[PDB]
């Protein structure tokens, strides 16, 4: 899993999905960033 999902706003999911892989392989799930 990557850093949580509660930072910034116009640039938060821009690195979460990529942390797992990218192309929809990572999003903000509640209070925990995980892969698809």
27: left (phi over 0), alpha (psi -120 to 50) or beta: beta
Measured on CA atoms in the order 18, 21, 27, 28, is the torsion positive or negative?
A: negative
Choose among 7, 10, 12, 8: nearest CA to 26: 12
Residue 5 CA, chain-centre distance (Å), reads: 6
On whether the CB atoms of residues 27 and 16 are closer than 8 A, the answer is: yes
- The DSSP code sequence of 3-24 is S-S-S-STTSHHHHHHHHTSSS
On whether the CB atoms of residues 28 and 20 are closer than 8 A, the answer is: no
Q: How far is CA 15 from CA 30, 35, in A?
A: 16, 12
Every domain of the chain and the residues it spans:
1-36
State the structure-solving technique. Answer: NMR
Question: Which secondary-structure segment (H or E) carries 28?
Answer: strand 27-29
DSSP annotation of 29 reads E
The Cβ of residue 35 has, within 10 Å, a number of other Cβ atoms equal to 16
């Amino acid at each position: 899993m990557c850093m949580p999902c509660f930072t910034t706003d116009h640039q938060m999911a821009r690195k979460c999905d990529d942390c797992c892989g990218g192309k929809g392989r990572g999003k903000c799930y509640g209070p925990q960033c995980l892969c698809r």
